[PDB]
Design a protein around this ligand. Structure first.
Ligand SMILES: [Zn+2]
Ligand SMILES: [Zn+2]
Ligand SMILES: [Zn+2]
Ligand SMILES: [Zn+2]
Ligand SMILES: [Zn+2]
Ligand SMILES: [Zn+2]
Ligand SMILES: [Zn+2]
Ligand SMILES: [Zn+2]
Ligand SMILES: [Zn+2]
Ligand SMILES: [Zn+2]
Lengths: 136, 136
């Protein structure tokens, strides 16, 4: 696959994560075929640790808004996200920038696709994942 | 930049991280121009949280080997990694798969570059970051 990197910033991030998991200075950084990284750390004494480094996601709360005084009928669970994404991309090719269920009740779902022409397409879908409206 | 994704697996990973940071079901996922993601969660009650989701690295120890009975003269600190990477890539274009300082003392540093021809190049460098040997 796309094993390795041309990014020194990325190798440094991998070395820094590894140094966070054990003692010693970095003596080796090696890409595994599964696209994880192994880093060797070695103490002054000569003691060795091998550390696995993986992609992870970190979540932090940004804002909070209390119960206005309704809840969501529909939600973006995994199944619904997979359905919207295939529907959004069938309609227009590009990168999904936005999904929501906010929507407008006859069109409960929205997606935005960013296309190579750096042009942004807002799509409105029915409960049945049918395209009901676009905005280009 | 390359904002968004065509990957439903990636959107699901973003939704899952977010659900790990607050209560409620996912009602929106939106890409920011800095290439972070914002996710809205909404409770049955109608209470909203916005959650920032970021790339992170996670490190876990894999193996341990005690002080054999020497330590490393040289180490891959950030400066040394930036130096090796530019030297490795000047010599051959492609993805770095390996850096080490293990080396052979007149050639203390090693890099492997994976090239588009899916061909793997081992480079040996002096203390001065000069190319001293290749293996193709
Ligand atoms: Zn899941
Ligand atoms: Zn469902
Ligand atoms: Zn809508
Ligand atoms: Zn819309
Ligand atoms: Zn419309
Ligand atoms: Zn640093
Ligand atoms: Zn240094
Ligand atoms: Zn060497
Ligand atoms: Zn070598
Ligand atoms: Zn040689």
């Amino acid at each position: 696959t796309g094993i390795g990197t041309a990014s020194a910033d990325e190798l440094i991030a991998i070395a820094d994560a590894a140094r966070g998991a054990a003692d010693g200075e970095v003596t080796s950084i090696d890409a595994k075929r599964d696209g994880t990284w192994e880093v060797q750390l070695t103490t002054a004494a000569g003691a060795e640790t091998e550390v696995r480094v993986d992609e992870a996601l970190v979540a932090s709360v940004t804002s909070t808004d209390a119960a206005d005084g309704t809840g969501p009928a529909l939600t973006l669970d995994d199944e619904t996200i997979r359905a919207l994404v295939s529907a959004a991309l069938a309609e227009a090719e590009g990168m999904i920038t936005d999904l929501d269920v906010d929507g407008d009740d006859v069109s409960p779902y929205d997606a935005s696709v960013l296309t190579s022409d750096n042009r942004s397409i807002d799509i409105d879908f029915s409960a049945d994942f049918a395209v009901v409206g676009t905005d280009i």
